[PDB]
Amino acid sequence: MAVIADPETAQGFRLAGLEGYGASSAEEAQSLLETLVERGGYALVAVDEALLPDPERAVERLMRGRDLPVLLPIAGLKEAFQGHDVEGYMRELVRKTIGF
Amino acid sequence: RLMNNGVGKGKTREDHKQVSDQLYSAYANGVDIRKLVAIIGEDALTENDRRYLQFADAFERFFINQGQQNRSIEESLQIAWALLSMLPQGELKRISKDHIGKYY
Amino acid sequence: RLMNNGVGKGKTREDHKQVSDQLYSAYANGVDIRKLVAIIGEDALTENDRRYLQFADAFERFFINQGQQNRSIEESLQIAWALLSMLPQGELKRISKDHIGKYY
Amino acid sequence: SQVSPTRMNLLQRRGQLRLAQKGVDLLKKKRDALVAEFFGLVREAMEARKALDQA
Amino acid sequence: TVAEYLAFEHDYHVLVILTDMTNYCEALREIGAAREEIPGRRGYPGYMYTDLATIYERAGVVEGKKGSVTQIPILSMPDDDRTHPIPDLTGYITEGQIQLSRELHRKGIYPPIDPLPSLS
């Protein structure tokens, strides 16, 4: 895997087990996307709440339903982050299937 | 059948003949949306639908009913106009702008 | 359509009545587990409902097939019960417990 | 463009209805299972995740 | 009868073609029923069979002759119900069976003849 994020939290990645590329410039991540999948040992590229989750559609134009690296946002400063559970319930339920 | 008859100036107001047709397709394309929601995904449909959506409601449970009570071509047409407002004027392509400047 | 007066206590076992309307809804319920099983393996289904696969199978195979074998109501009635033992109780629950305590 | 045939087909298209009607009978509850199994996973997901992510 | 005649004493290779048979029976019907006879099936008389036997049956070749009585009828029933009276019985009677295919037609392929029930 490899990820991008906040500068400050990006460090960790860069330490061990991962390859960071964090910046707060790109908000598209294509920049890695094509290159990344060349090996495919990167099975993830997390994104953070500090960006915006859904308009992955660049990736959607490439993947066309292909199970390549999938984000999950992250706080980048904990003080809480459980809301996207209590939200997440909805993330399936609002779009198809009866909502809440 | 008839209708493009007995309408227009000196018989009735002159915007009647026109404000027919607008409404027609408007309401039309409303329900049309509501079909396709239930197929692919409701919110997977065009965002400039949601208004045309809501527009179907107004003509719906807002207008049509009127219980028992006398009505008038005047009072009618007044609220016939009411219908249009929410959707832009730039989206009303079957009527000229003069009557739009007659009311809104 | 009419068969109620023909059985019951004082003519035959009282519990036969309800035994019949047990096994009915029980049987059928299972018989199309038969085909949804052709969509998804046993696992997706529970054990409890899975037993209703096996139920059918013995019901049809042994119970309903009856060859030339002449029989009698008791020799028959028991069989049924026995066969139901393959399910866990409270699933026959159109039967007061007493009766189940005399069979099973 | 064509209508149907004209006879016997009545019976066949009735077994069309049989096919449909009964088919779709079961067609939900195919899915009943999967929707059933779905809830557990909805629960499970964030548990450890939230905990040690912060830690 | 102009066929046998050319076939047998004159000896030939004549293709004989029939087209509008649909309309044959139309008129046929008229005398049929307007005079009397109980209809022998789906609004048509029953000896229709015969009347359409007697036409088609003539074809073929005899031993050692240089004739050839080729019947090629062509006709149209409405819709495409092969079960609409006319081609119906024709089927039994006759032999060949080649179909146009309505579907192919307006997707521009000519001749639209294809086997979909054409069965020689």
Place this chain on the structure above:
Amino acid sequence: PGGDMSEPVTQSTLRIVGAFWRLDASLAFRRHFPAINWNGSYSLFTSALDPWYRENVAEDYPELRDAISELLQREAGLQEIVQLVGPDALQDAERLVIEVGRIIREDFLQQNAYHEVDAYCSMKKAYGIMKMILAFYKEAEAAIKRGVSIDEILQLPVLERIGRARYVSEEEFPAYFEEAMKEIQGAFKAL
């Protein structure tokens, strides 16, 4: 005259016969012959031929044939369900059956009325065939239980060997078939 089977003169006839056959048309439009519906046609008379078979050919003959019919009519059992969601809800026992029966009609329910040998059949030849398939079915259960890909089960040559049986000719037939029972076990037991 309809071709519709509800027309009187036809139907009254059933009600006065002992064995029967029906012919679908698009069956026949396609290569199938002598196209009858495997579902749609019945006999009664077999419930008295059982002696003769039993002795004359073999003694397990009615057993193996009812065991065939089991599939032939049960196969429809899935067929309809195929037809409302596609054939893709398949797993093992799915494409087990589907395919089994498929070949069964391709070679065991179809004949020519023009190919020299494939126009005459003896019991005993047929008898053989009925064991071919059985076998294949049996071993297939144990391929699939083991976990084998039915995909490859298709592309085993031995499927194709069974796919030539009717074109074979009687004299050779005993051993032909007998060799193939080995070729079966070889193309099964090996994996």
Place this chain on the structure above:
Amino acid sequence: PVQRKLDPNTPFLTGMRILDVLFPVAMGGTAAIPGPFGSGKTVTQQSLAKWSNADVVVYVGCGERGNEMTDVLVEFPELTDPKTGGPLMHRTVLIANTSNMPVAAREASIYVGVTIAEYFRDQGFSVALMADSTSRWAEALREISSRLEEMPAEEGYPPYLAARLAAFYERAGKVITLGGEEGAVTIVGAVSPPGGDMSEPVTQSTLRIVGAFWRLDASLAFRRHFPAINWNGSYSLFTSALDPWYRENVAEDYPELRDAISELLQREAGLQEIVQLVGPDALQDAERLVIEVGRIIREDFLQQNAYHEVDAYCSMKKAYGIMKMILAFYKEAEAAIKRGVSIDEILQLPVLERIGRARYVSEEEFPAYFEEAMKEIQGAFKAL
């Protein structure tokens, strides 16, 4: 003749709650019922007549299945009126015939009863005719017309249909006697097509003329809930003209309850849908709450039975209080959950069960039993 026919606007009750409170029919009423018969559902028709609100029992079926036709006969004398203490059979009329009788037996069948009703009616009595195997009625008519020339129309039934059918119903309601009193001639149309179907002429014809339709079903019966009248597909145009009389005598807020309660169906039907097939698991309180309400309306308000002298029979005012309470239990219920209180607690307060027993509570202790019962709710809701 009868001179004036005056007008309907006057009830006709039977004491079977759901029936009359929900779908009243009046004395010009013309109803109809379907549902399997010769199996069990018939209970109602009988009991109907037992209590009624009439004073003359008149019943006839014709074309009824043999064996079933004998049940009536036999269980009939096991009734002693609960309004005289004398054998019920005294004031009863039986015209029946099997089916294997003479043709024109059946043709007259109706006409018989019909006539008879007027007779008694004329004496100032309110009658109660009921017809059964109504569906079969035409049959004979078919036969007859067979042996003539009449080719039919429709599926087979003769071209007269809506004809002979017609007059049969035109003998009901508020006739004035030549004695100057009134006599009620309501009829209920027990028809039954070959399989609950609704493209047989008979049904789709009848239906028109009459004013109230009472669909009955198997489903509800499999659920154990007799009477098993499926409410959502039933109707009675009657309601309109009945509204005056309703509120006049009964309660001024009387209509207001029924129309309020109907909202239930509307909002239960359309609430449930996927949700009910994925149960409690991601829902919310006010979601559930609705079907909680439903529960009470459905185990009490809906349920009733024919085996107790404290609940088969009813009056307006009896049910009226009941339903009132159930409204009154909802009205505080949304005020509870908006305070945030447990739902599934309220539902475990025995005060609510104390609503539950009211139906079995007898008529006479009833006024007070409602009175007292009621205010307990008031304090049980701000108890939390």
